[PDB]
């Protein structure tokens, strides 16, 4: 019984570490994409204001 629980713990832990590593990579790519688009928004906003 102790050997079975340990095997379960190993599976869960493996899944967890694998997911966390791949999630951090997505979050970083996402934030970068948002900042790039936000910067484009900011340039357009300044040009519109000057024209007005």
């Amino acid at each position: 019984m102790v050997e079975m629980i340990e095997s379960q713990t190993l599976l869960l832990t493996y899944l967890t570490i694998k997911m966390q590593k791949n999630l951090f990579r997505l979050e970083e790519k996402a934030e970068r994409n948002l900042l790039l688009v936000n910067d484009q928004k900011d340039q357009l906003q300044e040009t519109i204001h000057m024209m007005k």
């Binding site: 948002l34 688009v37 484009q40 928004k41 357009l44 906003q45 040009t47 519109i48 024209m51 007005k52």
Partner: protein, 49 residues
Amino acid sequence: QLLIKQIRDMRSEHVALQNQQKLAEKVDRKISDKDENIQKTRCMWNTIM
């Protein structure tokens, strides 16, 4: 999604404003004489009053 919507709206606004500026520049060359005309008018009034 929010950012996409905002950029689209701003682009539309920018085109509209560009059309309005092109109509206004056909009138402006002669501005180099404003401060001088105001002071001239003020001076004429001061003389009369």
